[PDB]
């Protein structure tokens, strides 16, 4: 009865942007992983530190379901030890990350004839994100010697850029929905079991 609410994470009507990545917490629920096995509609499925088969018989203190959207050329950056705009400025996973990365093409849902621009991503940042960090500040990035007092212009750019998602875009630029499951096990009771 108390099955973990994975449905509302994967089958969510709408998703969030990578810089504003959404996080859901899974605790106190039997973890039925049969939805990942049966659903063959997944393009990329890579787990690190743990295996999926020996996961329905293993408990955890808590699970985190992070959700966001990127383009196909960046899906490879969703993994430990990766570098790039997404890895460095929007969503970073730790080198010792323990979980699973799933990504599927959502070109049918996150594209408009005039171009769907509602999904954004951070373009500039003075430093790289720490693991599991969410930066949502809209501060004007200072690229030059002249300080920017909240105003844009010469070497003063808005840090967020919008994706160009059209039905005719190349597969490398089509939209992809990404779900990242991370498992934690501490010196505390385990509420999530398979």
């Amino acid at each position: 009865t108390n099955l973990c609410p994975f449905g509302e994470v994967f089958n969510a009507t709408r998703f969030a942007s990578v810089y504003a990545w959404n996080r859901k917490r899974i605790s106190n629920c039997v973890a039925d992983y049969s939805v990942l096995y049966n659903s063959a509609s997944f393009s990329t499925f890579k787990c690190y530190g743990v295996s999926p088969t020996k996961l329905n018989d293993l408990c955890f203190t808590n699970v985190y379901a992070d959700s966001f959207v990127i383009r196909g050329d960046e899906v490879r950056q969703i993994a430990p030890g990766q570098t790039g705009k997404i890895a460095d400025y929007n969503y970073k996973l730790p080198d010792d990350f323990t979980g699973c990365v799933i990504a599927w093409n959502s070109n049918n849902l996150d594209s408009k004839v005039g171009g769907n621009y509602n999904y954004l991503y951070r373009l500039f940042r003075k430093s790289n994100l720490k693991p599991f960090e969410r930066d949502i500040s809209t501060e004007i990035y200072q690229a030059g010697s002249t300080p920017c007092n909240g105003v844009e212009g010469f070497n003063c750019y808005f840090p967020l850029q919008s994706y160009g998602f059209q039905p005719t875009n190349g597969v490398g630029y089509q939209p992809y929905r990404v779900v990242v499951l991370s498992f934690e096990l501490l010196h505390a009771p385990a509420t999530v079991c398979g």
Epitope: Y37, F45, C47, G49, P52, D95, D96
Partner: antibody, heavy 121, light 109 residues
Framework: EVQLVESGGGVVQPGRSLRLSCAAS????????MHWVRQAPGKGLEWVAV????????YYADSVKGRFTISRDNSKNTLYLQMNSLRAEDTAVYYC??????????????WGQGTLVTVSS | DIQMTQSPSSLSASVGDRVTITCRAS??????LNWYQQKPGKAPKLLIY???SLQSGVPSRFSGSGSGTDFTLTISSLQPEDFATYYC??????????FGGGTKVEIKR
Amino acid sequence: EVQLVESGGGVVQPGRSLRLSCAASAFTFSSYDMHWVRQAPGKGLEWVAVISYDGSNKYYADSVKGRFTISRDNSKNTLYLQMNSLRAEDTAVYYCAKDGGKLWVYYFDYWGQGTLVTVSS
Amino acid sequence: DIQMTQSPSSLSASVGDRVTITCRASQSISSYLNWYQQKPGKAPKLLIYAASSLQSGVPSRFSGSGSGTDFTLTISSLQPEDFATYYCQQSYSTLALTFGGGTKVEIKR
């Protein structure tokens, strides 16, 4: 005393299909994840496919994804590998391997002697 | 993907020598590095798992070590039945299992 016996290997034209079968003995075959690993003549080992103990999960590497299929029959204590759309790169000796399940990750406990598969016409 | 560089490509040692083989990974793997052996023609055989865990039924003279990227496999005293090709295999990339190049230990002559 754990025994794995591969069979079904032969020579086959490119684009054809073949069926490898592994027979397990002397251990609970239905309670372990099973692996297939191939080695090309003169090359090293390369991971191919994995199936869960209950036969509900099936995972493959990128080089054969959507091309090979891995299944199992617990009642008959066997592990099947259907190789459809075989290419020249697929020419190798294929082994079936038990997992062990002692860690959170995959490691290969016992190896069968393998069966040869060559792709020519 | 993850590439496993295994060195030396091929070493020469005599019986009783303290043999050591290095395996380096492109990225970080916690301790999920396993060491296998294969005689010519025969099937591979498991030696070490979880980077320093000796498998049941293996002589104690084999020992693994190392964490992160640099891993080492050591035979304290070589024996005649140990001349084979040893591979190192990472597992951290669970669904992207990769093997090293191997290090054939020849009868140094």
